[PDB]
Amino acid sequence: ESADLRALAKHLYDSYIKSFPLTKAKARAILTGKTTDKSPFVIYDMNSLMMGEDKIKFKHITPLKEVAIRIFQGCQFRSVEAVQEITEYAKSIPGFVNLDLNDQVTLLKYGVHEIIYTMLASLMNKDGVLISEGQGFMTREFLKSLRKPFGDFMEPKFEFAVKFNALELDDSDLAIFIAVIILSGDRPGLLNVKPIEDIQDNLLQALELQLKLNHPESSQLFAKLLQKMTDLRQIVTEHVQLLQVIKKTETDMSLHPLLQEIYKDLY
């Protein structure tokens, strides 16, 4: 009944809080300056990128190339950690770890990029994006100004984010939405669709209830959200094509092996 769907929602929220250090709540506090915390370092050009290095240096990682490449490389280290976090979260989704291990792999492989863009939107406004767990703020114009094709790499993600952020979802809503994406029965090469769709059916009911309860004045938020799920696949396909382009035209960089695993035999 409704009660069970609320228990699922809350279970997912608590798991979500455990899995993802930087929430939409924390990010929006940083971006509105409603936090007591120190303001993030603003990166708006090459000079400011350089000066911010010590303050945006994640996990004391240091390069052993040009700015465009270094940005892309930093983005890679973050994405890998996002994949790890998303994998941990997925294993908390009731029923997921009981699926065929090959199907768990397939679900993660096609889902992680859709989720990464969903969660990236929590860190963005129309003027830029929070980075290094909220310690830096990279301007949208700076990212645009990078040489091609890198210059047009993040712009699609901003256009998505501005529209998605208008739905005004919080972490408790996103926790369920993300679980819905992971449990997609139409991913290519799934062995056994039925138990995936059974779980997704429950998740979708849980999401619809959650949206009704949490946004009572926001009519058809559930339907608006489901339409964005179909748009996310495009940002992903588009993104995969760009990666394919750069992997050929840029021998000075290469993909982390985790990201190799995910991108290969994908669209």
């Binding site: 994998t87 291990l101 695993e261």
Partner: peptide, 11 residues
């Protein structure tokens, strides 16, 4: 195939 993902999933 998917050695790391398998590892993360089984871990």
């Amino acid at each position: 195939r998917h050695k790391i993902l398998h590892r993360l999933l089984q871990e």
